[PDB]
């Protein structure tokens, strides 16, 4: 399967380098603009602002790993050592699963605000959104911890080893973990946003739009960008239970920067919370 090995090498060296390189540029400029916009324009934060700022911190953590990941794919090996293997493996999964959760909680916030514009409920308080943001970081850190435990069992002390559980280690345990993480990390938050879009549609039909716009964009972005990656991570593991295996790995490589395109485009959500932040950004410039 020398032909498929040539494809794997080219995909890593050229496709991943270029795609992550573009995400690094677009993501850094977009995230630093919205972060500085909040640091200099927003004086009294609500729940949605808290979640959006956390989303940018998650995106920025991921964007900071890209020079290391691009250099590793461009050169064909991991050379950064054990500490940076664990920290990068953490950040990549953490960014993926905190991002959809912050958008899920923003969606619930937009629904509660549609029913209770004056934010009288405890669930609508700024301090409660801070508590939920901290819960999101803790939950996601815990979802990612079995992968880190597995990595610490591999010979990372060698300095040039940083394995992917999708490609290495017991396929039976990697599949159970990958499928549970697909369910809890992806399908469940997506389903919750779908449920709250439906609750929003029903509320507005009774009372007879912007709240619908944010949630619809979130459902579309995550359905389109996360689905190929979650299918291929699971298919990559299942195939390990030949040329077919290398061909599946090539499909899997293709899906990875597509899921992380989310971190470069999700600063758009700052402009969908009805505060005219875009207009506020221009006033300061």
């Amino acid at each position, epitope marked *: 399967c020398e032909n498929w090995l040539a494809l794997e090498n080219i995909l890593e060296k050229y496709y991943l380098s270029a795609f992550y390189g573009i995400e690094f540029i677009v993501g850094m400029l977009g995230n630093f603009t919205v972060v500085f916009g909040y640091l200099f324009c927003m004086k009294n934060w609500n729940s949605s602002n808290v979640y959006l700022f956390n989303l940018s911190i998650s995106d920025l953590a991921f964007l900071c790993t890209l020079p290391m990941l691009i250099r590793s794919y461009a050169t064909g090996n991991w050379t950064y050592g054990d500490v940076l293997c664990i920290s990068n493996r953490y950040v990549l999964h953490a960014n993926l699963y905190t991002s959809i959760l912050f958008l899920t909680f923003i969606s619930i916030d937009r629904y509660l605000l549609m029913k209770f*514009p004056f934010r*009288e409920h405890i669930l609508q308080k700024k301090e409660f959104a801070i508590l939920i943001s901290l819960a999101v970081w803790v939950l996601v850190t815990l979802e990612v911890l079995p992968m880190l435990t597995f990595i610490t069992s591999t010979p990372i002390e060698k300095g040039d080893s940083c394995v992917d559980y999708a490609s290495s280690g017991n396929p039976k345990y990697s599949l159970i973990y990958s499928l549970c993480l697909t369910l809890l990390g992806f399908l469940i938050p997506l389903s919750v946003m779908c449920f709250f879009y439906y609750k929003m549609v029903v509320f507005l039909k009774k009372r007879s739009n912007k709240p619908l716009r944010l949630v619809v964009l979130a459902v579309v972005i995550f359905s389109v960008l996360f689905t190929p990656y979650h299918i291929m991570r699971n298919v990559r593991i299942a195939s390990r239970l030949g040329c077919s295996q290398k061909a599946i790995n090539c499909l899997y490589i293709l899906t990875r920067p597509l899921a992380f395109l989310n971190s470069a485009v999700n600063p758009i959500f700052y402009f969908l919370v009805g505060d005219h932040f875009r207009d506020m950004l221009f006033s300061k410039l």
Partner: nanobody, 128 residues
Framework: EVQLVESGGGLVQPGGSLRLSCEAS????????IGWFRQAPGKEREGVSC???????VYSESVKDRFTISRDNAKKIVYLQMNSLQPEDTAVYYC??????????????????????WGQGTQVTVSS
């Protein structure tokens, strides 16, 4: 460019009614959202009612079955009809104007923070 003055503040017996007015001075009020807020001594400011430039109205849960917000763009006035007032409604009532007419009423307690146009406030006292 608008200036606001609230009026109608007074003494009400519990269960009594009172109408406040928020009058504007400037070119036009048409494109403005107008929100009514109140602050009791030692308490935080809280929104009570808001009217968008399109005429949509929103009410806080504590005043929903009792207050009515309305506007007359020709007289450039916004009224707050307050019925069944209780001692807990004692506060200085203020009106605020948002030039983004469809913005304020989405999230009045948060979006009030972005506004530069406020009235001086009018005292409403509910005591037996």
């Amino acid at each position: 460019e608008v200036q606001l003055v609230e009026s109608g503040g007074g003494l009400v017996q519990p269960g009594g009614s009172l109408r406040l007015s928020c009058e504007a001075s400037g070119y036009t009020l048409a494109n403005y959202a107008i929100g009514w807020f109140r602050q009791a001594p030692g308490k935080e400011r809280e929104g009570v009612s808001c009217i968008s430039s399109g005429g949509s109205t929103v009410y806080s849960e504590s005043v929903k079955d009792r207050f009515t917000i309305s506007r007359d763009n020709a007289k450039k006035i916004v009224y707050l009809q307050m019925n069944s007032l209780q001692p807990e409604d004692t506060a200085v009532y203020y009106c605020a104007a948002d030039p983004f007419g469809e913005r304020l009423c989405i999230d009045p307690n948060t979006f009030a923070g972005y506004l530069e146009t406020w009235g001086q406030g009018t005292q409403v006292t509910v005591s037996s």
